[PDB]
Design a binder for this molecule. Structure first.
Ligand SMILES: CN1CCN([C@H]2CC[C@H](n3cc(-c4ccc(Oc5ccccc5)cc4)c4c(N)ncnc43)CC2)CC1
Ligand SMILES: [Ca+2]
Ligand SMILES: [Cl-]
Length: 423
């Protein structure tokens, strides 16, 4: 007999799914993945629920200060998000010490400004050997009344964010009749992009493909990562419709040329690059290939999260983003994507400017033949430019991995020794 509790509110929009509010308890009857079958103790109704909206009772996820399955960088991004103040904290799974936990706290220092520092939690639990607590709760309560060795006294927990609702069960292939393409967002050579609605209940974005231009997509849907755009469903009858999640802030390029994007400081740009590098690192680990990396194929969520789009799509069917071995001999690999990432990095740091300004494609290729590379912008840090340069090496094998680039960009302003604070 398994009993869960609802972490968030939820309004049912399907046939047999269940409505519930936070605090409500339910009885688990079946575990089929994203969708679980349960019975509400409040309404006595039996129906499907999003598994990621509930958790076992009196478990750790049920705590307002515990965030499961979150990395250090993600913790820092969430803590520095709007609606948080000094002392804002969270406890999470250590991503480098499996089985143990870590505490992330929001601090401030006049040199850097608002920061986020992380302490290791050793197992009873303790951060400092002088103070030992029976439970994690005792630890937080302790560090709420004084910092006793910490850089900041604990205040309120980090602002939680309601997760994305799971797509309809077994609804990968859908009939076109279920869609209402409401607004054309953009038009291109190979198709269009619309702001649609699925079954009158879910807002989505659909990429319509011209008939001239399924297996590859069946591969794509397995590439599920926070920094890739989620791929929900597809229409299998020409013209093919690709139904994905709707990114409110549009493409990265247009955002960088927007005014709000023009207000974005340098560390924010670097952060964007870190997210993109993270996603590309995921694709790298999965041994996949993007084949068309650029700010135009990067989308931005309303919360300023960057997600890689159109990955792998170029295969099924921009010399300035293309590596020379890819232009000359058509050799497309992950390293050419590293080159493209260099160019993208230049796009981001120059707020959407077009690469090689005042240069045509063949002119650019001939420049590359001479060993020419783009100069460093005024507002671009030397080290970041070095990263770009390492991305722009003639031999692809000598180009860095997305794992390394991600590691560097994540801790760009943090010394390796200063990742975790010791007490
Ligand atoms: C002048 N600009 C105006 C803005 N136009 C851009 C193009 C349309 C927008 N656009 C495009 C997309 C979009 C949709 C589906 C898609 O399919 C795949 C996803 C992963 C892997 C393979 C395929 C890829 C991308 C998009 C979106 N989802 N949610 C929100 N906006 C979206 C973003 C703006 C480009 C021209
Ligand atoms: Ca420097
Ligand atoms: Cl019962």
């Amino acid at each position: 007999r398994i009993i869960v509790v609802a972490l968030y509110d939820y309004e049912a929009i399907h046939h047999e799914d269940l409505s519930f509010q936070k605090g409500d308890q339910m009885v688990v009857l079946e575990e089929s993945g994203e969708w679980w079958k349960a019975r509400s103790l409040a309404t006595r109704k039996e129906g499907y629920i999003p598994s990621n909206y509930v958790a076992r009772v009196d478990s750790l996820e049920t705590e307002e200060w515990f965030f499961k399955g979150i990395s250090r960088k993600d913790a820092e991004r969430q803590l520095l998000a709007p609606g948080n103040m000094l002392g804002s904290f969270m406890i999470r799974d250590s991503e480098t010490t499996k089985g143990s936990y870590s505490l992330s706290v929001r601090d401030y220092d006049p040199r850097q400004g608002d920061t986020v520092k992380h302490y290791k939690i050793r197992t009873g639990f303790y951060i400092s050997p002088r103070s030992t607590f029976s439970t994690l709760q005792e630890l937080v309560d302790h560090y709420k009344k004084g910092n006793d060795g910490l850089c900041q006294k604990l205040s309120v927990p980090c602002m939680s964010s309601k997760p994305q609702k799971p797509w309809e069960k077994d609804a990968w292939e859908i009939p076109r009749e279920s869609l209402k393409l409401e607004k054309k967002l953009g038009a291109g050579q190979f198709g269009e992009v619309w702001m649609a609605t699925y079954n009158k209940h879910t807002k989505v974005a659909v990429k319509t493909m011209k008939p001239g231009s399924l297996a590859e997509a069946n591969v794509m849907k397995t590439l599920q990562h926070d920094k890739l755009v989620k791929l929900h469903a597809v229409v299998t009858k020409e013209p093919i419709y690709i139904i994905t999640e709707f990114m409110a802030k549009g493409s990265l390029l247009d955002f960088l040329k927007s005014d709000e994007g023009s207000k974005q400081p340098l560390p924010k740009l670097i952060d964007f690059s870190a997210q993109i590098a993270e996603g590309m690192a995921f694709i790298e680990q999965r041994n996949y290939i993007h084949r068309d990396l650029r700010a135009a194929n990067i989308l931005v969520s309303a919360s300023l999260v960057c997600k890689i789009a159109d990955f792998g799509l170029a295969r099924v069917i921009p010399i300035k983003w293309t590596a020379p071995e890819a232009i000359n001999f058509g050799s497309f690999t992950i390293k050419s994507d590293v080159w493209s990432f260099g160019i993208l990095l230049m796009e981001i740091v120059t707020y959407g400017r077009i690469p090689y300004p005042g240069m045509s494609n063949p002119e650019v290729i001939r420049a590359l033949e001479r060993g020419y590379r783009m100069p460093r912008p005024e507002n671009c840090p030397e080290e970041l430019y070095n990263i770009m340069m390492r991305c722009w090496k003639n031999r692809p094998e000598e180009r860095p991995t997305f794992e390394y680039i991600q590691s560097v960009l994540d801790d760009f302003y943090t010394a390796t020794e200063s990742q975790y604070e010791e007490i």
